[PDB]
């Protein structure tokens, strides 16, 4: 059941890692939790942060410096892992861009990935209800953000679940996975070769039909020196689709910033404030 | 010569890593540099941060979240490595508490360490003058801080060089290395069996005879859940010695906090503010 395997006091709250037996994944999963000092006095809003390729549930906790801002605003931070671990699927670790550390936040339909690679259901349902049942977190004040594969994850999960996520932001998301190699490989393997099945997991397609209730729209930060800007991320495709659909998007482009956590750390404080304007309302 | 090998924009400044051919070490060395935005219009004060056992030049840059505070106060951050790298001394990597990653910021006098393990002279002279010659840093506004072996280093280097280091603070320092296993092993190996020679690298011994005083005081943060508090750190010994010599020390003990960077990150903003009181005068 629910096991506390790591805990460190941090900005007058606690940075924890839990392990639990996931019924949706069918395997043990680890996730990180930051509780701010305010959680001692009642339930608090929470943000789910989704990490990118090769990352773990601890990458964000170590590298983003988000806990100070979570403590300042009274928001908990939940960090899922990026894939199932130790599923024993043949060659699930043969590449870093697919399989282990590379679940792409989809529910796989193709064998042999469909048995365990159910990260969409895991993050939006089982992990959420576990957090709500066992931690002092408000069910009605949840937001989501993430980086790259995780920024793809944050946009997709928010646009598909308006009943759950009240705010959404992203750092350097894979904005149009149907049209870059990382996404086309992931979708081909997990979902099959029928591109129509991929649209339900593509932020740029979802925004064309989404009905949203975001007070301050969708926040995206993108570094202009990002090595993946033209080869994988394609923010302009999402920006154009959201404009045609009338969806408010604040896409901020920053000259000279790269893809990684020196970039993410610079803007994560503004992201936590952005979410707090909705979640702490 | 001076090679820029990493650079990422961060909090409107730059996080850099440099490689240079060290004459004092006799080998290439890597060091980290954070320049705040203010360094673009003039020289800025600088803080040297010394890392603990097993760390590298980038541990602080990645894990401490200090750049945000340095950018607010206009302080550069310089992070030396913890030891020579690739010196080829037999078995120098046999144990994690000695040799590689474990220079203890001393100048070794015993062979075979004496050839390259000159981290005291490296940090206080060669690295300092390289920084002052090649980067927009004020010679008269330098301070020093660090963690564990690096907290030992920060205290030792400040108390020995009051005309260099104008402010000093520490996270969980090895406060009396002559009286704990980490220090006894390192000093025995690097310095030999004459314990008198160890007193010049022992913060608790140095404070007993320090003539000059830091009138802004010495700031030390210690977590009470730290696993090394009673086995290696001994903050009480330095406290007792400082009290008896009239050196003001603010030793803050924090219930529940551990040894690592969730603890360090929590207080590093207060440390940069503390140093800025003197360095940004």
Helices (H), A91-148: 119-121, 127-134
* Of residues B180, B206, B189, B44, the one with CA closest to residue B110: B189
Q: Is residue B191 part of a domain?
A: no
Candidate from B8, B12, B262 with C-beta closest to A9: B262
CB pairs under 8 A between A and B: 63
CATH code for the domain in which residue B69 is found: 3.40.50.1820
Q: DSSP letter at A15? A: E
Q: What is the dihedral of CA A153, A156, A159, A165, to 10 degrees?
A: -20
Q: Is residue B51 part of a domain?
A: yes
3-state SS, residue B223:
strand
B232: Cβ contacts below 8 Å, ≥ 6 apart? B174, B180, B181, B182, B183
β pairing state of B28-35 and B3-10: unpaired
**Domains: count for chain B:** 1
Cβ within 8 Å, pair A11-B266? yes
Tokens of B227: 């696993």
β pairing state of A165-171 and A218-223: parallel
Handedness of CA B25, B29, B33, B39 (dihedral sign): positive
Q: Are A70 and A76 in contact (CB under 8 A)?
A: yes
* Of residues A191, A193, A211, the one with CA closest to residue A201: A191
Q: Are A77 and A70 in contact (CB under 8 A)?
A: yes
Q: Are A66 and A171 in contact (CB under 8 A)?
A: no
What are residue B85's phi and psi, to 5 degrees? Answer: -120, 135
The coordinates were experimentally obtained by X-ray
Q: Are B12 and B72 in contact (CB under 8 A)?
A: no
Q: Is residue B39 part of a domain?
A: yes
Q: Say whether residue B15 is in contact with chain A using an 8 A CB cutoff.
A: yes
**Domain span at residue A170?**
3-279
Tell me how far apart the alpha carbons of residues A225 and B208 are, in angstroms, rounded to a whole number. 52
Tokens of B190: 């690097």
Which of B81, B152, B226, B275 does the annotation list as catalytic?
A: B226
Cβ within 8 Å, pair A67-B257? no
Q: Which residues of B touch A8 (CB under 8 A)?
A: 257-258, 260, 262-263
């Amino acid at each position: 059941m629910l096991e506390l395997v790591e805990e460190h006091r941090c900005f007058s709250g606690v940075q924890r890692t839990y392990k639990h037996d996931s019924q949706t994944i069918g395997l043990p999963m680890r996730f990180s939790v930051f509780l701010p000092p305010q959680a001692a006095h009642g339930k608090v809003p929470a943000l789910f942060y989704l990490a990118g390729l090769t990352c773990t549930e601890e990458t964000f906790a170590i590298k983003a410096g988000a806990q100070r801002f979570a403590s300042e605003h009274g928001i908990a931070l939940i960090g899922p892992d990026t894939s199932p671990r130790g599923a024993g699927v043949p060659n699930e670790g043969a590449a870093w861009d697919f399989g282990v550390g590379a679940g792409f936040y989809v529910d796989a339909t193709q064998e042999p990935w469909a048995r365990n690679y159910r990260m969409y259901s895991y993050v939006t349902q089982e992990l959420r209800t576990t957090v709500l049942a066992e931690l002092p977190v408000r069910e009605d004040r949840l937001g989501i953000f993430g980086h790259s594969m995780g920024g793809h994850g944050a946009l997709v999960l928010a646009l598909r679940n308006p009943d759950i996520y009240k705010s959404v932001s992203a750092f350097a998301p894979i904005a149009a996975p149907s049209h870059c190699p990382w996404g086309e490989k992931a979708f081909s393997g997990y979902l099959g070769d029928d591109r129509e099945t991929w649209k339900q997991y593509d932020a740029s397609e979802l925004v064309k039909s989404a009905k949203t209730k975001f007070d301050a729209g969708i926040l995206i930060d993108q570094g202009l020196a990002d090595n993946f800007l033209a080869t994988q991320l394609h923010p302009e495709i999402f920006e154009a689709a959201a404009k045609a659909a009338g969806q408010a998007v604040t896409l901020r482009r920053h000259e000279g910033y790269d893809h990684g956590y020196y970039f993410i750390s610079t803007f994560i404080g503004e992201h936590v404030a952005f979410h707090a304007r909705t979640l702490c309302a």
